[PDB]
Structure 1
Amino acid sequence: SGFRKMAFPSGKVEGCMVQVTCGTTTLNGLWLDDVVYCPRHVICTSEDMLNPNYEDLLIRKSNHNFLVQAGNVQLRVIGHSMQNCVLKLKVDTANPKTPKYKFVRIQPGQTFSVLACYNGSPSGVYQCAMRPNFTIKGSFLNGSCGSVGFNIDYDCVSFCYMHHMELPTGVHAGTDLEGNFYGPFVDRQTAQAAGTDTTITVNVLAWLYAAVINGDRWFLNRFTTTLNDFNLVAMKYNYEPLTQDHVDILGPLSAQTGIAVLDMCASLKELLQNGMNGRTILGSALLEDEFTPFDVVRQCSGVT
């Protein structure tokens, strides 16, 4: 028992972290096979970041201008290319610690672990979620760019995020491993505001099921509701609308606890209308939306 914001073991990702330097700019890179992936703004000076033309900036760069260090040793760069907002630096050595991996573009509401890195070295690991406004609420300082977000299925690492920037609001924006930004963000030092941060409803419901499994049952009520009635409440509280797909994915949690999804929705509805009244659920005084139904099942069953 007990429920924690748990990250995947980071070992397979630590073995992929390198340092990329271009001129006076140093950030993190991800070395998989003979390719090093990093944000393209590594070629920029703070003056360039105001309005950068990456195609023109890259013309003045050769393979020898990209310095890639893996731990203590230097990698030889034999190729360089730009794919959307990431640079792919072909090196002459395959990473001997390359795990089985995939590049996946996640949907908003999905969760992932972040391995925060500085100068190619890992500093920490934490669990995150791609928000419905396509930002992440991470913990990154200057130098953390190139840090990656990922998921793990037994021995396969699915890379889903690469950190590029921090918005003036303290929230973070980044790309998938093909260099496409999540959301409308551009890799430019220009004011970019994030849209409405809505609550991931299916994840809060998954977390209420995790609380029921762990003994926290005070919020269970004698009521039920419908998808349309629940969504009227969800809209009012800036919650994501619940669909039959969401109900379907909550099926195993509903089966394990014997609490129908629409019944759990009615508990959530009352919690939204009345608040927690000074109580806590899984040691939290607010409704947690950064655990997917998959995360709850995984943690509650011990998937390694």
Structure 2
Amino acid sequence: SGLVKMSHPSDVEACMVQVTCGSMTLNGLWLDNTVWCPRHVMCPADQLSDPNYDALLISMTNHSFSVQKHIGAPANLRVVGHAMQGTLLKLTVDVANPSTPAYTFTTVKPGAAFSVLACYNGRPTGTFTVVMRPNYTIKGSFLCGSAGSVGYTKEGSVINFCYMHQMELANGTHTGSAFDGTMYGAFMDKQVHQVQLTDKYCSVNVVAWLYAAILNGCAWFVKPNRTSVVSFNEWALANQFTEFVGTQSVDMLAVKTGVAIEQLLYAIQQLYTGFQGKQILGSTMLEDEFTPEDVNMQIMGVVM
């Protein structure tokens, strides 16, 4: 038993490289004959407020990009093509990464969790799990040099790459791109004022976490009282919570505990006004980064 922040084992390490363009360096992801990296690797430090990426791109040649693998079997790769796709570069290299995993590209939705491999100078340093916030940021831990760090989920041994790190928006607040090149939240990859929409508690994840708590012998907050999903969602609009949408993963926790979703919706309304000195799974505030899927896996060993 127990519930902790858990990340995937980090297949992904053997794909990380360093990409250098003139005076700038960051991380890239080497999949088959493609190295993906952020397009701001092209931008001099003094132009990050107003880059003209179209012009920067035209000024580059294949020779402008230096790609190196430091980790595992080392290597220097030759760039034989370059293109810009949204906020990313797609560099073609002349060696296919022999450690390329089975993979897909996905775009995650608010409330969904993924693992991040934080890297600097093409060297992985750490891993942690985040949730895509309702305002299309993540709350991570990243310093200068981390751009090109990637975020992923798994399904079996398929890695689903969903995030490539770009920038910090505010203290402990981060964003990046999907591998189609779009930035989450349509933030702009430059140093300009943007400000995020307001963050919200992810209701379905708070429910998951309360189920985890019940399953771990912590059920003091459960009462007979119920609040409907409809009425909860009305309240949620006024109190900085997302709209609750149930799933089969949530229904499995309800079946296993015999505690209805609507009892936890009521519990949430009450706990938001205070925990009255008590704690839930070590916390005295609501936790909304454990998904129903995560709870089902950690507590039951159950995937589907």
TM-score with structure 2 setting the length: 0.95
Confirm or deny: 8 A CA contact 2:27 2:122 kept in the other structure: yes
Deviation for aligned residue 1:30: 0.3
| Secondary structure of the corresponding residue to residue 167 of structure 1 | strand
Residues 63 and 95 of structure 1, relative CA distance in 2, 3 Å threshold = same
Q: What is the CA–CA distance in structure 2 between the aligned matches of 1:282 and 1:133, rounded to whole Å?
A: 26
| Secondary structure of the corresponding residue to residue 199 of structure 1 | coil
Q: What corresponds to 1:73 in structure 2?
A: 75
Q: What is the CA–CA distance in structure 2 between the aligned matches of 1:179 and 1:295, rounded to whole Å?
A: 28
Q: What corresponds to 2:275 in structure 1?
A: 276
Q: What corresponds to 1:44 in structure 2?
A: 43
CA distances 1:31-64 after superposition (whole Å, capped 9, x unpaired): 0111000000000011221111111001111111
Residues 104 and 247 of structure 1, relative CA distance in 2, 3 Å threshold = closer
| Secondary structure of the corresponding residue to residue 45 of structure 2 | coil
Q: What corresponds to 2:58 in structure 1?
A: 59
Instruction: Trace 1:1-304 onto structure 2 (pairs within 5 A).
Output: 1-10=1-10, 12-71=11-70, 72-243=74-245, 246=246, 248-273=248-273, 275-302=274-301
Q: What is the CA–CA distance in structure 1 between the aligned matches of 2:209 and 2:47, rounded to whole Å?
A: 44
Deviation for aligned residue 1:229: 2.2
When structure 1 is superposed on structure 2, of 279-288 and 143-152 the one drifting more is: 279-288
Q: What is the CA–CA distance in structure 2 between the aligned matches of 1:173 and 1:207, rounded to whole Å?
A: 25
Deviation for aligned residue 1:2: 0.8
| Secondary structure of the corresponding residue to residue 266 of structure 1 | helix
Q: What is the CA–CA distance in structure 2 between the aligned matches of 1:112 and 1:18, rounded to whole Å?
A: 21
Deviation for aligned residue 1:70: 0.7
Residues 303 and 79 of structure 1, relative CA distance in 2, 3 Å threshold = farther
One-letter amino acid of the structure 2 residue matched with residue 258 of structure 1? G
One-letter amino acid of the structure 1 residue matched with residue 289 of structure 2? E
| Secondary structure of the corresponding residue to residue 95 of structure 1 | coil
Corresponding pairs, count: 300
Confirm or deny: 8 A CA contact 2:141 2:172 kept in the other structure: no
Residues 290 and 258 of structure 1, relative CA distance in 2, 3 Å threshold = same
| Secondary structure of the corresponding residue to residue 238 of structure 1 | coil
CA distances 1:204-243 after superposition (whole Å, capped 9, x unpaired): 0011101111111111112112122222332332001223
Q: What is the CA–CA distance in structure 2 between the aligned matches of 1:191 and 1:267, rounded to whole Å?
A: 38
One-letter amino acid of the structure 1 residue matched with residue 24 of structure 2? T
Deviation for aligned residue 1:278: 2.0
Confirm or deny: 8 A CA contact 1:237 1:272 kept in the other structure: no
- Give the % identical residues: 50
Confirm or deny: 8 A CA contact 1:168 1:191 kept in the other structure: no
Q: What is the CA–CA distance in structure 1 between the aligned matches of 2:167 and 2:17, rounded to whole Å?
A: 19
Deviation for aligned residue 1:25: 0.5
One-letter amino acid of the structure 2 residue matched with residue 66 of structure 1? F
Q: What is the CA–CA distance in structure 1 between the aligned matches of 2:2 and 2:250, rounded to whole Å?
A: 20
One-letter amino acid of the structure 1 residue matched with residue 80 of structure 2? I
Query: After the TM superposition, which segments of 4 or more aligned residues of structure 1 sit over 6 Å from their partners?
Result: none
Confirm or deny: 8 A CA contact 2:249 2:296 kept in the other structure: no
Q: What is the CA–CA distance in structure 2 between the aligned matches of 1:247 and 1:91, rounded to whole Å?
A: 42
Deviation for aligned residue 1:247: 5.2
Deviation for aligned residue 1:153: 1.2
CA distances 1:135-188 after superposition (whole Å, capped 9, x unpaired): 011100000000011001120100000110111444101110111001020011
